[model samples]
Target: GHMKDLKGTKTAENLKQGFIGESMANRRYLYFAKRADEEGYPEIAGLLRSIAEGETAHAFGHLDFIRQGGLTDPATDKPIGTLEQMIESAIAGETYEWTQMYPGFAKVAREEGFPEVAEWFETLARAEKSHAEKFQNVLKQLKGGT
Candidate 1:
């Protein structure tokens, strides 16, 4: 457990967690998109898929940076989790990314005077907040207004 030459390697591992989060996010969005399309909401399905593609890009970009293989589709994993947990997880994640992470980045990036880059991030972050609300409403509908 004691090592001086392992800090750099540990940093890489920590960054890999971000890549894993991205891949998990891509899976969640694609699942929602496929379900929406199957339920006859093609327009919403397309929007969901378009956003899923953005998540895919981020996941794959991280993979490319780490010189790892590309992100793959989610496997036929067991669905022991409930729908409420799933929806809540989605809402919480989106909220964290949009409200906290993106804004934090935007604040610092603005100090660097990169107006365009900050604008782009802030715009996407707002969209993520909308996504969070959408999922929260869906969760309420599933709960029968309880």
Candidate 2:
């Protein structure tokens, strides 16, 4: 069955953002975890590895909400991303989400009588900030190790 178009809806937008954010975090954290393992920080690597899975769980939660909605993208095709490009893209996206996107979304949600949604946005924003920092640290470590 064809789902109703949800391109302009808040549920669709929020779930889309959530899915992308969590998915990026999952990928970035796996790289971070591997780097940590290489650097002899086994415990830190384990935590990053665990949190990568947690990020995937968050992505699935958004997927559940987004189910078959907002699948159409009228925009240009996505770029084919290399690993280096992907990490750079993740850093940029995480920075934006934490510093701007989620904060704005949370504010709007708070004013629109969805305090829970606002809280979730805030929670994800903090997580994004952490994810960005972790990626930055890993990138620096990689540079230094090379």
Candidate 3:
């Protein structure tokens, strides 16, 4: 249920399944490769590792397909998003992280008496704020004739 929160139709659900399946299989094959190495079967280990890579590629493809929107126009190999749009998305993510996600976690950590974890959460929140600020600066640059 890792991606269960994402609401979608059959296609999205299927792609999620494919991604999770391929991802786990890649890890499983990697483990198998390590076992092969321990057992002194280099050829088998090499084959297992290659299959693991193939699984990783499949998982990546499936996950990217799930997004439906990509960074570029795959057909023409051209840019799809404007620089401002990209920065907008970046700022939105960082804003969520700093304002809601990390802050909520920090509150929970403090309540649970994990001061160390709470402190780290505050640090991460500050870091995310810095990222948002940095991206904000680029927007400033674009407007100020950069």
Candidate 4:
């Protein structure tokens, strides 16, 4: 129901979702970074924290765009998981997006003769794979430590 009252409603909706997703990633990556530090992976922790800051910047950018689009806030959200649980959840999400969701969208975009749209989907798919691999690497390290 967020941004439902705005003109350019669809763009507003997209921006709001972008804001929410980037905000979540920001928090999740911060949590992952802390866990990495606790598990004796300071370099990995630094990388995660740096990316978390980037994600925060992304969220703020989306917020600015949403304000330009006119905004509403009827949506409430929360995250629930231990560090390990969160890692698993993130890996699952990124894997699904890269291996299934984005590829499916790319296929549809190609069929619709939208090569640019397809390329965008593929680009996102690659990024999601990178994210999933990061989580998986940390998960592996944590498991080996335990």
Global lDDT of each candidate: 0.71, 0.75, 0.78, 0.78
Quote the positional error of residue 29 for candidate 1 in Å.
17
Q: How many clashes show up in model 2?
A: 0
How many residue pairs clash in all the candidates, one count each?
0, 0, 0, 0
Q: TM per model?
A: 0.48, 0.45, 0.53, 0.47
Better of 2 and 3 by lDDT: 3
Top candidate, metric TM-score: 3
lDDT of candidate 1 over 126-146, digit per residue (tens): 998999999989989999985
Give the alpha carbon lDDT tens digit for every residue of 31-93 in model 4.
998899889999999999999989989988875665444454313211212466557767888
Tens-digit lDDT string for candidate 2 (43-108): 999999898989989987776555445242211111213444445656777898999999999999
Q: Deviation in angstroms for 121 in model 1?
A: 1.0
Candidate 3 segments whose C-alpha is farther than 4 A from its true place = 1-8, 13-83, 142-146
Between candidates 2 and 3, the TM-score winner: 3
Which candidate, 2 or 4, would have the higher TM-score against the true structure?
4
The lDDT, on a scale of 0 to 1, for candidate 1 is 0.71
| Residue-level lDDT tens digits of model 3 in 11-113 | 6567667877898899999999999999999999999999999998998787567544443322222332577756766777788889999999999999999
Q: What does the lDDT come to for candidate 2?
A: 0.75
Q: On a 0 to 1 TM-score scale, where does candidate 3 land against the true structure?
A: 0.53
